[PDB]
Design an enzyme around this catalytic site. Sequence first.
Site, mmCIF file in Angstrom:
data_model
loop_
_atom_site.group_PDB
_atom_site.id
_atom_site.type_symbol
_atom_site.label_atom_id
_atom_site.label_comp_id
_atom_site.label_asym_id
_atom_site.label_seq_id
_atom_site.Cartn_x
_atom_site.Cartn_y
_atom_site.Cartn_z
ATOM 1 N N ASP A 289 0.850 -1.182 0.000
ATOM 2 C CA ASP A 289 0.000 0.000 0.000
ATOM 3 C C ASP A 289 0.879 1.222 0.000
ATOM 4 O O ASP A 289 2.131 1.112 0.040
ATOM 5 C CB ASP A 289 -1.030 -0.025 1.123
ATOM 6 C CG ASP A 289 -2.291 0.798 0.814
ATOM 7 O OD1 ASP A 289 -2.189 1.750 0.004
ATOM 8 O OD2 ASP A 289 -3.353 0.506 1.409
ATOM 9 N N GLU A 495 -10.925 6.743 3.777
ATOM 10 C CA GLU A 495 -9.969 6.233 4.729
ATOM 11 C C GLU A 495 -10.150 6.885 6.087
ATOM 12 O O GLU A 495 -11.260 6.938 6.555
ATOM 13 C CB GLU A 495 -8.516 6.202 4.262
ATOM 14 C CG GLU A 495 -7.865 7.397 3.724
ATOM 15 C CD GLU A 495 -6.483 7.598 4.331
ATOM 16 O OE1 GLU A 495 -5.503 7.590 3.573
ATOM 17 O OE2 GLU A 495 -6.376 7.751 5.548
HETATM 18 O O1 LIG Z 1 -3.974 5.088 -4.122
HETATM 19 C C1 LIG Z 1 -3.162 3.994 -4.003
HETATM 20 C C2 LIG Z 1 -3.509 3.063 -2.834
HETATM 21 O O2 LIG Z 1 -3.229 3.886 -1.703
HETATM 22 C C3 LIG Z 1 -3.988 4.048 -0.540
HETATM 23 S S1 LIG Z 1 -4.814 5.683 -0.678
HETATM 24 C C4 LIG Z 1 -3.500 6.960 -0.749
HETATM 25 C C5 LIG Z 1 -3.878 8.042 -1.733
HETATM 26 O O3 LIG Z 1 -3.967 7.526 -3.079
HETATM 27 C C6 LIG Z 1 -2.783 9.116 -1.726
HETATM 28 O O4 LIG Z 1 -3.192 10.232 -2.565
HETATM 29 C C7 LIG Z 1 -2.693 9.596 -0.272
HETATM 30 O O5 LIG Z 1 -1.585 10.484 -0.187
HETATM 31 C C8 LIG Z 1 -1.644 11.349 0.986
HETATM 32 C C9 LIG Z 1 -0.854 10.734 2.155
HETATM 33 O O6 LIG Z 1 -1.656 9.728 2.803
HETATM 34 C C10 LIG Z 1 -0.551 11.862 3.171
HETATM 35 O O7 LIG Z 1 0.072 11.300 4.331
HETATM 36 C C11 LIG Z 1 0.304 12.989 2.588
HETATM 37 S S2 LIG Z 1 0.553 14.428 3.709
HETATM 38 O O8 LIG Z 1 -0.427 13.530 1.496
HETATM 39 C C12 LIG Z 1 -1.132 12.707 0.546
HETATM 40 C C13 LIG Z 1 -2.406 13.525 0.308
HETATM 41 O O9 LIG Z 1 -1.979 14.014 -0.918
HETATM 42 O O10 LIG Z 1 -2.235 8.579 0.589
HETATM 43 C C14 LIG Z 1 -3.274 7.543 0.679
HETATM 44 C C15 LIG Z 1 -2.855 6.490 1.741
HETATM 45 O O11 LIG Z 1 -2.940 7.119 3.061
HETATM 46 C C16 LIG Z 1 -5.127 3.004 -0.266
HETATM 47 O O12 LIG Z 1 -5.141 2.416 1.060
HETATM 48 C C17 LIG Z 1 -5.210 1.954 -1.346
HETATM 49 O O13 LIG Z 1 -6.551 1.298 -1.332
HETATM 50 C C18 LIG Z 1 -4.973 2.563 -2.739
HETATM 51 O O14 LIG Z 1 -5.087 1.579 -3.762
#
Ligand SMILES: OC[C@H]1O[C@@H](S[C@H]2[C@H](O)[C@@H](O)[C@H](O[C@H]3[C@H](O)[C@@H](O)[C@H](S)O[C@@H]3CO)O[C@@H]2CO)[C@H](O)[C@@H](O)[C@@H]1O
Length: 606
Positions: A289, A495
């Site tokens: 992830d 989330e």
């Molecule tokens: O998308 C891919 C797989 O990832 C996670 S969701 C993932 C979001 O896609 C991503 O944009 C987001 O980025 C944030 C970080 O969590 C933050 O800590 C930093 S400050 O900033 C960005 C916001 O731009 O991160 C997400 C994970 O926390 C899913 O769990 C999967 O299902 C998904 O396929």
Amino acid sequence: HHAADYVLYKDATKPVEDRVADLLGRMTLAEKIGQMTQIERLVATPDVLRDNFIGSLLSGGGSVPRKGATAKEWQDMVDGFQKACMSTRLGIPMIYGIDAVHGQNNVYGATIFPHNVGLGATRDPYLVKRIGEATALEVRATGIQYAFAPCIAVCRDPRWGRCYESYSEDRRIVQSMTELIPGLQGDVPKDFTSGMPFVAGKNKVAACAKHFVGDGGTVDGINENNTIINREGLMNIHMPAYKNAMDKGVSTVMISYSSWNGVKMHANQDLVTGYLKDTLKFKGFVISDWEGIDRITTPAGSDYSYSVKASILAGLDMIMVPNKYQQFISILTGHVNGGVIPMSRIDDAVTRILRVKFTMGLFENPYADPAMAEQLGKQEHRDLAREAARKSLVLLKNGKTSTDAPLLPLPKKAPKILVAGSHADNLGYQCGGWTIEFQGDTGRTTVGTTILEAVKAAVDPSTVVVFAENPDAEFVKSGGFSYAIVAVGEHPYTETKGDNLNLTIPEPGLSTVQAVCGGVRCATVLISGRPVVVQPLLAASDALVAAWLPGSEGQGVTDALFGDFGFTGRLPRTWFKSVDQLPMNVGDAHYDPLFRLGYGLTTNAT
Ligand SMILES: OC[C@H]1O[C@@H](S[C@H]2[C@H](O)[C@@H](O)[C@H](O[C@H]3[C@H](O)[C@@H](O)[C@H](S)O[C@@H]3CO)O[C@@H]2CO)[C@H](O)[C@@H](O)[C@@H]1O
Ligand SMILES: *[C@@H]1O[C@H](CO)[C@@H](O)[C@H](O)[C@H]1NC(C)=O
Ligand SMILES: *[C@@H]1O[C@H](CO)[C@@H](O)[C@H](O)[C@H]1NC(C)=O
């Protein structure tokens, strides 16, 4: 097999395993570790991709070339990245992944399907397969080859922010909905070996069963937290659908941020390698992830060298870095150069990544097909989403007493009707999270039909439709309305932002329903990702519909309200009386639901 300059891995007529082995044997360490590295588009350039032999790219939620980008803009982006990767010494094409989890939902103008909880309400696996088929087409419209779906979490506590991404608290329903897989990837051949990866070719996408394992079992629904359950319960509730995914040839599996009895999944060798790989015989690739290896530690990212060791030794094949690729590649190279990670583990990870890429045709069709661009938002797909939305609706109440005339279906011809509520004319709210933005958004964020627009499109031309977002009681009493349709509910989330211990809808929501229903017979449409505190909404309303997060095609809602079709959906989750009960799932010893799993009133088509 022919020309002087013949290279077996480049020969499309050769067996995939022969192509894998031929290519693997040629690779440098840097070439191998590059295949194991997935990076964000936001950090990618031609030189980065070439110089580091990068294997994969992704768009995270909201990561788009620009707001409003066309399908061709996306194809051109992806092809730009691919041209760079194809220019390396070995010319190994990159695979591009994205969260196409209810349609191709980052993309403007993509059809947005109901979220998974509503899909569970349909009990219609063939519908879900057709949704996977339509979604593959809309993903390939944008040049993308890999969707991070399905989420086969079995959410056991609706306080979880990702509960709407679960088809049901009942593993048997989740298992049934694994039909998304052969929708997205194509059906496997008659002979097929369970655990092998499969994608039919350039009009399908690689799929991803996620998130392995027990993401939906975490304490108090706290996202990314600990799932405290014995092995028998893990294997009985959280694991089964992964075996159905193996039987259907799921190409990839993504690991959960969650822990199982205090062990981080991203570090769990016994489950990743011992179970998934060695017991289920999974032969596709295992992906982390996002910053999942970083989050093995507390604080996250505080010992990245350990994160790389632990995850890679646990059996992960591809690392969603997604930003700090230079640190990842350097640390992993160091560990191999040091003997801490054996070349055998590297070679296994690369074998699996290459196996998926060759299987799916990616070496034969590395570039986008411009003719597919018109698949995006195609009306046939929207008609499918409209069918799904309508099937997903669960009618909870249809008359305040047993003797009242049922309110639904409503007549299309009436002199004047009221449509009200925060959620009656808000496309972003009816789509929920993972739509355009990561967290979703408010308002007219893409192409679609709101509830209000749906009502206007359905009614007789003589019917006057009045919209008032939050009317007071007097306005309703004075308005000469025949009936009102009132839509309220949860705001979009994804989330951890969605984790919620009280599960009450924001105001004004209840107050609007109370004002409206107090003046005229009312049908309340509840937009939510999950069950929410509902007794007060029920007490006020003549009829109440759980419409979940039905997506871009609001006419699905009105198809059932006005009787074009009967209500058929059944609760895929328990509806609790209070949050103090939670967790509380069908089959528990102490089961006292407001509405049990499987509950749903029906109507007949007018
Ligand atoms: O998308 C891919 C797989 O990832 C996670 S969701 C993932 C979001 O896609 C991503 O944009 C987001 O980025 C944030 C970080 O969590 C933050 O800590 C930093 S400050 O900033 C960005 C916001 O731009 O991160 C997400 C994970 O926390 C899913 O769990 C999967 O299902 C998904 O396929
Ligand atoms: C669970 O969340 C708590 C409360 O925020 C936190 O202290 C703990 O580190 C989390 N546990 C795991 C395994 O993620
Ligand atoms: C709907 O159809 C069912 C099945 O035939 C029938 O038993 C029921 O009376 C019908 N109800 C209404 C309101 O038409």
